[PDB]
DNA sequence: TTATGTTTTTCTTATGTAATACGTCTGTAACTTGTTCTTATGTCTGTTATGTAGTTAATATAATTGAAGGATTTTAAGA
DNA sequence: TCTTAAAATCGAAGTTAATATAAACTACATAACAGACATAAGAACAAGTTACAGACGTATTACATAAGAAAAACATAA
């Protein structure tokens, strides 16, 4: 699923409000975003992330992503 | 030959130095809760349309409506 | 027992889409329409509370290095 707006991701409000303020619209920014600079964002720690890789492994999607053109 | 002052060395402690681990403060969010302004609606009331009931005094005094090349068979009523 | 009147029936589908003449007035009660008001339902704004997250700030732990103190060895004088 790299075609789905990221409010689409059924994100709780704080994660979807930090998100959003990065200019990440899709996912396709997200999965090969990496998991240190997810990090060092403001309002993100460890225990969000978790939820923000676990919606992803739902969808099959994951961070780590090696990826292609747009 | 031996006692003693000295100097260098090693052990001991002290201030800083850093690493990882974990608690506090604070910043956002979920959950409610009170207050005020707005709105659709149910209900009351006045006015007009309308629907019903009644009355009318030359005299007048036993329908109508078609209906029209039907044959064949069965079964009740008359005699 | 013989006429004689009634009674009933007469293939399927498919199609096959209206007619169409002919008293007045008055009084009264009832229903319907329009306007306005109050009420129940609804929406928006702001506030309290209860909690969890996030990154900073505290305390536990293991030390590096340099200053200070004790001690052993050495050289010298009586």
């Given at each position: 699923i790299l075609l789905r707006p990221v409010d689409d991701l059924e994100l709780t409000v704080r994660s979807a409000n930090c998100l959003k303020a990065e200019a990440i619209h899709y996912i396709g920014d997200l999965v090969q975003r990496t998991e240190v600079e997810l990090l060092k964002t403001?309002?993100?720690?460890k225990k969000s992330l978790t939820e923000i890789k676990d919606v992803l492994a739902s969808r099959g999607l994951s961070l780590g992503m090696r990826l292609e053109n747009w």
């Open positions: 403001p309002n993100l720690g």
